């Protein structure tokens, strides 16, 4: 088992000092190393106000840019016992899902690039591109938007976005269908993926996998159906549960949630209400710029909110959503101050990597590459 | 509501069908057809210098400091753009200009520190600091990226016409 | 069908002035297509928009030599386009 | 469109026919207007050299009934 220090530029998100002892081409033990991307996200937040810590969440796992923001939002809203306005909720579910697609296009196509199939990535990165443009025309940034803030969305959708999030959705399916005709039944995709990294159901719950990784093993758990957040309760979608959990089965699950998210996006476009996109409590949400420039109470509320902060009531909460990777949760302890006290980010990914050892046993070097792909490891969330 | 993604007789017809699939690589040929199909589709790439990828009015891009039409710079050094910057990028120190008005002696946005959040655009009461459309400001030296008041004011003067159009389009939304 | 495809290719080649004119467009851009000229800015630049082409390529600018006396004919730069016409090129505003 | 992959191919094709036409005309010009005889078995060489010994100092030169 000659340690190969296999890793950094490898087939991971830049940083995997995956030191491994391999008897020839068989892996005896995998000890993943982490922290090549630790940056301090958890300590930095303690020194920043709630609204100026929102941009950190987008960077925690940036393939899933917004879905992460929703988790902090929800958490800060709970502590304040404020809830967003109805239109904002639908928006967050609209962009929440668009983001899930974006993550799955990343996970399925990047999985293939490491496997060696390169054309699916270019096919779907063009669709991704088109989605980014939604982000940009809603937030201003292609990724790292900062659109979902603790009290709702920042600004209403541009006048015309919904129509385009339709044209795209109306077609994206065929694009998923194509990838399929190239990989779902490839006589070769199956081999490198089938029966690789099988994880039992009991073991998946035990190692805290909590994601497709659980769903792929047949455990039925979607925090979006079990514990509804926002208005994911008002929509109707089917969790894609899997059997014979293995790299191929979970994949099929990720392609199926891409499909189910188009079902949720359709609805959101069909039923998004007229209304405001941010709470009306100037206490939590910043006042509209026409108001702060004509009304004294609004300037005072604008000045205090931007300079000092929300001033969340003292308490602590663990709120978890179903980020595309898995359960993303923020444990946000908070003193009465405007800046948080602690904000442990639970990363679906710290648990998944740990499982690499119990998944890739008696496996070849190529198998390890396939399994890192089937966990959608974004080192930002793991390293935080 | 759940769904089984992969949850599952032997007849000559069936077997012969299956054996042909393994022997003559039928599904592999299916995959080749898909790629041949696109080869015939129009490529989606754009001539980058000649044609530019579309950015709508809210694109944050590069920082600029605006001026009133009259010509008086908008910033009045309230310094909350400094307060809400997440990265500590903006450094502002001020003193009363001889006019008696309030102006910033030094306004330095460290763009390498800045993470282009666009909150400064949000926070300014006079809306003096704006996220300008330009994204192409790559520089040979690190020092050029650090920007003082004169570069930003100059950036503001160069892009004021488009900045005004962009703010014009999006202010009702804000 | 393809003969009309061939006539379209011939018109594109004849479209850029003389043989030398298209050679000039050919070398600096590597793409030959004909479009209505929306405007020419005071810094030497020429802008064309074609409705038929897809969203990414329907608006293009053919840069001109020495727009500030820089010998820009070969070292084309994105920043050369003026701020007024930058948003038209990036589709920020439909109006020219 | 896909039209453009053709330029490159053209220069490949043209560079894969040259060799076959070239080798097959530098033979018919360095062997007196006749394919270069292929001496695979001793007998084909014999007649090939016998012919050399027959006339001139080259095989392509072929003396006929008028000799």
């Amino acid at each position: 088992n000659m340690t190969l220090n296999f890793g950094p530029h490898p087939a991971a998100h830049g940083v995997l000092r995956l030191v491994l002892e391999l008897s020839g081409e068989m892996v005896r033990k995998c000890d993943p190393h982490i922290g090549l991307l630790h940056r301090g996200t958890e300590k930095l937040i303690e020194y920043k106000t709630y609204l100026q810590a929102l941009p950190y969440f987008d960077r925690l796992d940036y393939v899933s840019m917004m879905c992460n923001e929703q988790a902090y939002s929800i958490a800060v809203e709970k502590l304040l016992n404020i809830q967003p306005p109805p239109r904002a909720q639908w928006i967050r579910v609209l962009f929440g899902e668009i983001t899930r697609i974006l993550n799955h296009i990343m996970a399925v196509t990047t999985h293939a690039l490491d496997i060696g199939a390169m054309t699916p990535f270019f096919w779907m990165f063009e669709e991704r591109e088109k989605m980014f443009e939604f982000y940009e025309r809603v937030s201003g940034a292609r990724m790292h938007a900062a659109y979902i803030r603790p009290g709702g969305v920042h600004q209403d959708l541009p006048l015309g976005l919904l129509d385009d999030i339709y044209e795209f959705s109306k077609n994206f399916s065929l694009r998923i269908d194509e990838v399929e005709e190239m990989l779902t039944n490839n006589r070769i995709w199956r081999n490198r993926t089938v029966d690789i990294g099988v994880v039992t159901a009991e073991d998946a719950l035990n190692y805290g996998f909590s994601g497709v990784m659980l769903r792929g093993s047949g455990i039925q758990w979607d925090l979006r159906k079990t514990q509804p957040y926002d208005v994911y309760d008002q929509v109707e979608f089917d969790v894609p549960i899997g059997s014979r959990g293995d790299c191929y089965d979970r994949y099929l699950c990720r392609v199926e949630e891409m499909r189910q998210s188009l079902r949720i996006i359709e609805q959101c476009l069909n039923k998004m209400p007229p209304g405001e996109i941010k709470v009306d409590d100037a206490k939590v949400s910043p006042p509209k710029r026409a108001e702060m420039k004509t009304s004294m109470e609004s300037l005072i509320h604008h000045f205090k909110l931007y300079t000092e902060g929300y001033q969340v009531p003292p308490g602590a909460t663990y709120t978890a959503i179903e980020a595309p990777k898995g359960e993303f949760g923020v444990y946000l302890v908070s003193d009465g101050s405007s800046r948080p006290y602690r904000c442990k980010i639970k990363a679906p990914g710290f648990a998944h990597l740990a499982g690499l050892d119990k998944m890739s046993k008696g496996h070849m070097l190529a198998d390890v590459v396939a399994i890192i792909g089937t966990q959608d490891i974004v080192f930002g969330e793991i390293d935080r | 509501t759940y769904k089984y993604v992969n949850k599952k007789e032997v007849d000559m017809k069936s077997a012969t069908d299956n054996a042909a699939r393994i022997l003559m690589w039928t599904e592999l040929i299916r995959g080749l057809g898909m790629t041949l199909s696109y080869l015939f589709r129009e490529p989606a790439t754009i001539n980058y210098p000649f044609e530019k990828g579309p950015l709508s009015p809210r694109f944050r891009g590069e920082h600029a400091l605006r001026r009133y039409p009259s010509g008086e710079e908008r910033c009045i050094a309230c310094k909350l753009c400094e307060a809400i910057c997440p990265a500590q990028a903006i450094t502002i120190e001020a003193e009363p200009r001889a006019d008696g008005s309030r102006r910033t002696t030094r306004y330095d946005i460290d763009m390498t520190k800045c993470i282009y959040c666009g909150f400064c655009q949000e926070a300014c009461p006079v809306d003096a600091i704006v996220e300008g459309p330009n994204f192409e400001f790559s520089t040979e030296t690190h020092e050029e990226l650090l920007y003082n008041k004169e570069k930003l004011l100059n950036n503001g003067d160069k892009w004021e016409a488009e900045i005004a159009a962009n703010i014009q389009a999006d202010y009702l939304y804000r | 069908e393809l003969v009309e495809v061939l006539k379209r290719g011939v018109q594109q080649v004849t479209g850029h002035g003389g043989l030398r004119g298209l050679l000039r467009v050919f070398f600096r851009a590597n793409d030959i297509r004909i479009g209505t000229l929306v405007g020419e800015d005071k810094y030497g630049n020429k802008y064309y928009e074609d409705n038929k082409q897809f969203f990414g390529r329907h608006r293009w600018v053919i840069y001109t030599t020495e727009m500030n006396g820089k010998n820009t004919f070969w070292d084309v730069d994105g920043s050369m386009v003026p701020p007024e016409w930058h948003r038209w090129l990036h589709c920020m505003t439909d109006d020219p | 469109m896909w039209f453009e992959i053709l330029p490159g191919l053209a220069i490949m094709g043209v560079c894969l026919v040259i060799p076959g036409v070239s080798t097959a005309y530098i033979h018919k010009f360095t062997n007196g207007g006749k394919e270069k005889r292929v001496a695979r078995v001793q007998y084909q060489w014999y007649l090939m050299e016998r012919d050399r010994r027959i006339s001139g100092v080259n095989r392509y030169y072929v003396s006929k009934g008028l000799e």
Binding site: E126, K130, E167, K170, N171, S173, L174, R175, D177, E178, E181 | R30, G33, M34, L36, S37, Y38, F40, R41, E42, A44 | E1, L2, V5, N51, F54, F55 | M1, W2
Partner: peptide, 28 residues
């Protein structure tokens, strides 16, 4: 687009579905 009605049919036959309905070129 600009399939010409023959490249489109090779495209449809090879793909096995109608890309014309869901094109890669976004239009007005």
């Amino acid at each position: 687009a600009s399939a010409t009605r023959v490249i489109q049919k090779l495209r449809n036959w090879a793909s096995g579905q109608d890309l014309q309905a869901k094109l890669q070129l976004r239009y007005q």
